[PDB]
Design a protein around this ligand. Sequence first.
Ligand SMILES: Cc1cn([C@H]2C[C@H](O)[C@@H](COP(=O)(O)OP(=O)(O)O[C@@H]3C[C@](C)(N)C(=O)[C@@H](C)O3)O2)c(=O)[nH]c1=O
Ligand SMILES: Nc1ncnc2c1ncn2[C@@H]1O[C@H](CSCC[C@H](N)C(=O)O)[C@@H](O)[C@H]1O
Ligand SMILES: [Zn+2]
Length: 405
Amino acid sequence: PTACRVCGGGVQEFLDLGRQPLSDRFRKPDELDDEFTYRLAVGRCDSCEMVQLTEEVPRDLMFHEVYPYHSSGSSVMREHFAMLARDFLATELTGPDPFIVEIGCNDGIMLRTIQEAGVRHLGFEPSSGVAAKAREKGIRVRTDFFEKATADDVRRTEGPANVIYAANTLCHIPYVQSVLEGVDALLAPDGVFVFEDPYLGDIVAKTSFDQIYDENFFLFSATSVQGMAQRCGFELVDVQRLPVHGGEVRYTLARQGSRTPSAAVAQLLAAEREQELSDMATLRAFAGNVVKIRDELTALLHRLRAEGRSVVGYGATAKSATVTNFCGIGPDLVHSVYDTTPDKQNRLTPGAHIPVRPASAFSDPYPDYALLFAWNHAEEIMAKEQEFHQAGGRWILYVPEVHIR
Ligand SMILES: Cc1cn([C@H]2C[C@H](O)[C@@H](COP(=O)(O)OP(=O)(O)O[C@@H]3C[C@](C)(N)C(=O)[C@@H](C)O3)O2)c(=O)[nH]c1=O
Ligand SMILES: Nc1ncnc2c1ncn2[C@@H]1O[C@H](CSCC[C@H](N)C(=O)O)[C@@H](O)[C@H]1O
Ligand SMILES: [Zn+2]
C-alpha cells in the first residue's frame, strides 16, 4: 500500500497501465534498446480524495539538460499565455515594483510578456536547455527546481512575490508539500498562487487516459485542491475551466481568509459531488472504459493493416507513450510519427520505438490515415493540414471514443 503525498492517507488503486518507459526520452535509432521502466498505476487517497500515481519517477530522470518539450511550439498556447500575462499585469501586478515568479517557465512562453512590460520576474526552470531559450529573450531564469529551500533563497535576495504561477508543472511534482512550504515562505501576504493542470472531470468524461504518464503524478479536481490548500493554510478562491490540453482548471490559492472565494468555487465543488466524480465506482468505471478504448483501437489498427491501408501518427506527445505501450502499438501498425520539435526528430518514440520525422515531411503523397496523438491541438494542426484532408487522408482519434473523420 502507498501513502498519499498530500495527507499520508491510504491510496487505493483503480487503474493499472502496466510497465512504462520515460515518456520524454527519444532515442537515436542506434541506441541500445534499454530503457528505464516503472509501473504506471493510479489510485485515490482514502482521506483527501487526491487522485495520484502509485510509483514516482525520480525528478532528475525526467527533467534535465536535454528535456525536449518546447512550449512555444503551439500558436494557441503562445496566445493563451500572453493573455494570462496581460491579465496579471492589469490586476495583481499593478503596484510599485511588483514581482512575479513562474514555476516551470520552459522557453519563456509566459514570462516574455512580463519582461516586455518592464516588470521584475524570475522563472524556475531546472531543464537547462529550455532555460537557455528563455534567457535569450532577456528573461531572468534560475536553473533549479522550485521547492522549500530554493524558495527561501529567492525570498532572502528578492523579497516577496505578488504572484507565483505554474502551468502544467504542479501536476508533476509529488513533493507538493515542499512546494507549498516554498510558496508560504515566498508569497506576499496579499498574493496569489495560481496553477493550471489537466482536470480530473475532463479525463473521466473523455476517457483521456493518455493524460496519465510519468509527468502527470496528480489528476487534480476542485475537491482535492480545496483540501490540499486548506491543510496547508491556503484557500481555493477561484477556479476557471480552460479548453487547453484536453481540459484544464486554473486554481487560484490565497492565504486563508484573505480573499472571499468566487461563486465559481462552490459551483464546481457541487457539480463534482453531484456527478460523483471522485467516488471509487466512477473511477473504476473510467478504468473499464480505458480497456474498451484499448481493445477498439487495436482492433481498428489491425483491420486497417489487413485492408492494406497506411497509418502514421501526428504529434510525438509525451502522452502518446501511454497509448503505444499500454495498447502494444509499434511501427508495424503506425509507421512514423510527425512532429515540429527538432530535438524529437530523427529519433524513436519511447518503449514502442516508432520513428519520428519532421512535420514538414507529412506532405503529398499522404498516408491513408493519421492517428492524432496531438488531439488537444486538433484545430491548430488541422488548419495547417487542410491539403491532407482535401486529398482524402483521414484522422483517427481515440478521444472521447475511437472514431475516424
Ligand atoms: C501544435 C503542434 C504540436 N506539434 C507537436 C509538438 C509536440 O511535440 C506535440 C504536442 O505536445 P503537447 O500536446 O503540447 O504536449 P505533451 O503531450 O508532449 O506533454 C508535454 C509534457 C508536459 C510538460 N508534461 C505537459 O503536460 C504538456 C504541457 O507538455 O505535438 C506539432 O507537430 N504540430 C503542431 O502544430
Ligand atoms: N520543481 C520544479 N520547479 C520548476 N520547474 C519544474 C519543476 N519540476 C519540473 N519543472 C519544469 O516543468 C516544466 C514542465 S513543461 C510545461 C511548461 C510550461 N509552463 C507550459 O505550460 O507549457 C519543464 O520545463 C520542467 O523542467
Ligand atoms: Zn490524501
